[PDB]
Amino acid sequence: QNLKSTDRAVQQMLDKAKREGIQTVWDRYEAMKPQCGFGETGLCCRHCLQGPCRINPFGDEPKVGICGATAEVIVARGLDRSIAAGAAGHSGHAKHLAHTLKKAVQGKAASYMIKDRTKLHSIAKRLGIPTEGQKDEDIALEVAKAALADFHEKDTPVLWVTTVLPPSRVKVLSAHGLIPAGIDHEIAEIMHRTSMGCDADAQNLLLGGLRCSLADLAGCYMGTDLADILFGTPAPVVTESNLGVLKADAVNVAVHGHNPVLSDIIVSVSKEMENEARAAGATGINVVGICCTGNEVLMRHGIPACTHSVSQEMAMITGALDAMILDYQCIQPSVATIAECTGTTVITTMEMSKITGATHVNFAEEAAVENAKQILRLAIDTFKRRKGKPVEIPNIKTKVVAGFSTEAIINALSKLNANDPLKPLIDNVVNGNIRGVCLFAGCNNVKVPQDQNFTTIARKLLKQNVLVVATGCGAGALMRHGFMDPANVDELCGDGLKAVLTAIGEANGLGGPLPPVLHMGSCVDNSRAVALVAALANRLGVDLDRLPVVASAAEAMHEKAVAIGTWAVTIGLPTHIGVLPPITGSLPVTQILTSSVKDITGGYFIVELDPETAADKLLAAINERRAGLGLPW
Amino acid sequence: QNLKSTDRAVQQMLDKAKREGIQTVWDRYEAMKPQCGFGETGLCCRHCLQGPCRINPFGDEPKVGICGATAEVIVARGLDRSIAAGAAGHSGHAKHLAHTLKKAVQGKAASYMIKDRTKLHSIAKRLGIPTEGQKDEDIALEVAKAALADFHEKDTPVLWVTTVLPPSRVKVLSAHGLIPAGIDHEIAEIMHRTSMGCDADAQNLLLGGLRCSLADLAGCYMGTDLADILFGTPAPVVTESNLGVLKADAVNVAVHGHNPVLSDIIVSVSKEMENEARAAGATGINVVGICCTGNEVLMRHGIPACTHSVSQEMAMITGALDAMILDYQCIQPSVATIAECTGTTVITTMEMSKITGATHVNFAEEAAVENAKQILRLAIDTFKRRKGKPVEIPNIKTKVVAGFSTEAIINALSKLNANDPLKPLIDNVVNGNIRGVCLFAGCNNVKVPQDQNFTTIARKLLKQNVLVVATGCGAGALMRHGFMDPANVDELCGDGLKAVLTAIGEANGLGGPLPPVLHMGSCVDNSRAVALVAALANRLGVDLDRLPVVASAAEAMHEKAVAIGTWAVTIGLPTHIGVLPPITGSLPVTQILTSSVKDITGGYFIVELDPETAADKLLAAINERRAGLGLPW
């Protein structure tokens, strides 16, 4: 089973699924082979009813689409649609939170409130919203209106782009016409320009894609900002991960999806319902996380993470998962069918994300506590039905230190230099103790043995003294393999990095180092890494494309990951992707995305499926940046 | 060549292309055969990097997508994306016109102005915008702001839906949650919900698709409204169509695309440049139309239509097309390559729609006259280079009477009943002289011999006394085969329909009938048919799903046509489509779209590729509606 997942708990559940005849994501992948090479290379178009059009990568006809669309146009249009779809997800998440904040401060949703008043005021100041003499509720109402205004054209550009990057970077992007005019405006313009008989120049198409990726960035940053106002900015926390966090004698409730607007409430209400669970014969309610909603409550409340991404079905296979509470994004719809075999109650909560055969509970912010209790009572009912039945929870878990928001990272650094907190980090970049920074982001993908690229690359970078930060299911992969346990610093980290992690941790009263990898949160919280990198650029007086900072979507799957990778390139980072995106059918598109975009934004994609080779390429990118700053490497 | 096109001028140019070795859309189609059956049936998904996933329609594995997405989810997600892409095009067109009107009334674009002040005031009244005591420029500024506001969420729903359909229809749609909250909001929500791991219930997905189709309707209606304010509401006009409208001794300039914001200016400026053209050895500038921008200037100014849709390359093959001036949508990008052989200067004008190898002229409303003169001077240069060369313009054209805006139709009817203009039409529906109404809409499609479905269906309906109206390239197909020439009324029309067309025409001072088919304009001007049908419903006191009105996208191609067909169903019409949409791989989706949606909106799709059978099915739908109103049939 090691060829499917490198996670030993997942392997154990794959054996259980096999002997019980439960079909998994890996079985469905095997049944798909061999996959279509036209789609894999990007040489397929279905944008009108004259299609499908395909193009043979080499040889004889077909060589061009029916309407005349070339291989490079077809490849660029498909890629742009993926970017727009990703932007639509991250910004739909952000839009929902903006409406939640507006309802809260207008007295329409008493379960929600301004929890981080400091963050509220800093965001207002960053946006140019006056705070002196204003009530918090009025400032927040203005912030929520500004968030909603960024979805459409107005007299200013998207402020969740222009106010979050340094003026020099905004100037570069503006010169190329890349600043978004409105988030949903850009998504719609992509769908228009890529429709039949519209944009048919690969460079023009890809420039539109870069601009739409910045609309995705704006949605990510807005989502983090609003979630922090509503639910609190993360600070360091200690918890656990992997399937062993499930407890046979408790009501096990997974929160799964991305938007934690209800799942933050689930966490608090579940505490109130201890006694009701105890009356049912359970020790209590054990809330666990899956995917990014799990990251959100891990970051803010220390909720343990049960599993992530490709292996999500395995939590159900234990037999102990009483409920899976779903919002949207990255939920395999197979869960609704597997639930018939495993007994789990799968519950959807968002109007636009339902799954046939799953129970739906309308969630409304105005009734959030009431909805939570109804949902948790279904979970309690499910626990009762399995009283007495054996379960198979693998006794496998790791320790996870997390909660490294950018505010938390700055505060940790400020223990070494109170009035200039970024300086200790820059000092160690300059002296070589920190070679550079790598952000791991994105998903697992069934084509890659689960976690193998994240861990193989992370190990090589850590040995070379790279400061590694992680979000999303990249953070999930690293946490499940021990990369967030400070006890593994000695094994994993080069001497210089160990010295820095130890110096920071000792100054924070820990008696021990920071963990080998800093967990910066969910997928939208890739925006936190942007905030840190922008602050470093501002402090050094250089643009982001001069910093020794790279990104790696080492096992990417979702359209959201394509959008993130593209905005990482657009803000100026060398950006690795470890699965093939559908671009290899066009050499001109590949050349733009891996080479000539350097001349536009300073960033570029590094496509590399072999993880040892990818780590070498990422280190070369970091070291090239070091050389450009005159640093040793 | 008759198997490729039923248009004799197109056949002549296909022979010329063949002997000159110029590859056409039909050659590129032949080179694509056999096409992929997974894509044709809808059983392919590329929404994440685990794909492509396909599903065998019958037999053995694969049976389900890798993530667990069923055939019905995959089919519904793909369809929803097509609807959103169509909505993005029609509403991008409308958004551009809203910005043009705003610039005009703020003194920023002197080439544009309020030409239809009556239409402006009626729209303002329909929207609830006060007009008493207000300057026209202020009313128009308010209308343009309202148009822009409908793209995003606000305290009202999309007013270009709720103010254009009768309250009873709005109530039905509201009860099912189908009223759009904002145009670009719905497009983004579709892209979100159809991304991996999000909506996975076919009924829920398709209801979202119906709502997004109404965002498309709003964009169509807004585009017609704003184009009428800026450029004038159409009134009846007489002109010609087909390749014989090109003139060997003139500078022939085609306007091609959809948004006539510059091409209306091209028409006026070309008149000013007669003498400059005459100095070059030409008789003048002969502006001709292709596709919907051609329809726009045909409707408003009588500009002759040269060709449409699938046969657009053939205008270039004549050797006489000096320039092709492009905005966006439905332009085969092959034109940029064919131009090397034919000498035509292909010019793009919109930032988001460029074609490699075509000259780009930045158009800006603020410089519209200056841009037009630069473009027309390139055309004049091109004419000079072909002085002396023979050309092959087929001597084939038809007479076209057009300009039937809904205002024009009401005014024509008012000559029979001044104070109750709809009553003469209803009278003849009730007595059987008019059996019903059919709207022909949409594109040609290379899979169908060009125009064969439109003409075969139209002939059968006209013989059965159906009032036939047409837009877009459906109007193009019918005009090129004589269906807009009143001289063909005797041959084509049943006795009852002939009596009505004759009575209306005689009362309008014509001495002869209205044409066999009423040309209601461009693709966005499908909204004019909605306005007429809604007015009829309001006058009869019934909802639209009780009227004997149907639609036929008989040769559909573009994502825009999928969106139009879907909103035709959503507002309550039986809606034929004559090419296979990618739904046959899912019986449950097909059943929803062809059967159970009747219980939701009262409309339904009729999928039928054989045109004689399609006409029988459309007549059965009309006659079922007649029976429900207690009428003979």
Ligand code: SF4
């Ligand atoms: S848009 Fe062009 S390439 Fe795509 S399916 Fe239609 S004809 Fe084929």
Ligand code: SF4
């Ligand atoms: S979304 Fe599901 S069905 Fe579509 S490509 Fe990804 S795994 Fe396959």
Ligand code: FES
């Ligand atoms: S031919 Fe397989 S993805 Fe289209």
Ligand code: FES
């Ligand atoms: S397998 Fe051919 S369209 Fe995807």
